[PDB]
């Protein structure tokens, strides 16, 4: 917050349109399974 970020380039530049606000911060992981959703609810999840 309250920080500026100043770009400058004379070529070869792929610029942002959109950035990303960190709203909710907490717990999660990037789980590495290959199953798709099954509409259930748990309190324990594992990739299998």
């Amino acid at each position: 917050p309250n920080d500026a970020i100043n770009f400058e380039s004379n070529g070869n530049f792929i610029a942002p349109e959109y950035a990303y606000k960190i709203v909710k911060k907490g717990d999660s992981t990037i789980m590495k399974s290959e199953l798709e959703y099954g509409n259930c609810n748990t309190k324990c999840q594992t990739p299998m």
């Binding site: 717990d27 992981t29 990037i30 789980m31 590495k32």
Partner: protein
């Protein structure tokens, strides 16, 4: 086992006893039949139950687990990450496996006293009012009806009450009377 009751002098269990883990069978002119010592089967269960609940309560602060990801040229810090988790899961497996194996041995040798010590209570109450027969079992010198069995069973037998009944018998199966 250790205490020498279960699979010891008391050779094998009775299938006829269903109400509980330990008990008494009897025989007398009216009766004959089993009856579990619930109050001490009950005390035993309070134990074994606490034991399970103690182990669950030790296994909520294991080493925790959440996930992490590695570059192709960081391969050897990937390794270190792996040796680590695979170190910790080698260690909590051993602790689980061994705890169960040990607490299993103790639980089995716990039941083996529960039964010995029950046998010793009956014994200490009945003294020379009854003949310890040695296969887990006592036979009385004085006849002792269903109302007297409970008294032994609920642990308030009364030695002086049957003393002269009993010792008339002891006195005569000593054949000391055979001298007249």
């Amino acid at each position: 086992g250790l205490f020498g009751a279960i699979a010891g002098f008391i050779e094998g269990g009775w299938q006829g006893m269903v109400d509980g883990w330990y008990g008494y069978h009897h025989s007398n002119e009216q009766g004959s039949g089993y009856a579990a010592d619930k109050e001490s089967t009950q005390k035993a269960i309070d134990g074994v139950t606490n034991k399970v609940n103690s182990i669950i309560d030790k296994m909520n602060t294991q080493f925790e687990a959440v996930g992490r990801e590695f570059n192709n040229l960081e391969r050897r810090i990937e390794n270190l990450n792996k040796k680590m988790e695979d170190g910790f899961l080698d260690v909590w497996t051993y602790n689980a496996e061994l705890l169960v194996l040990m607490e299993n041995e103790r639980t089995l040798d716990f039941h083996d006293s529960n039964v010995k010590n029950l046998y010793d209570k009956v014994r200490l109450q009945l003294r020379d009012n009854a003949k310890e027969l040695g296969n887990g079992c006592f036979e009385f010198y004085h006849k002792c009806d269903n109302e007297c069995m409970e008294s032994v069973r609920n642990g308030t037998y009364d030695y002086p009450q049957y003393s002269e009944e009993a010792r008339l018998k002891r006195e005569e199966i000593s054949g000391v009377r055979s001298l007249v």
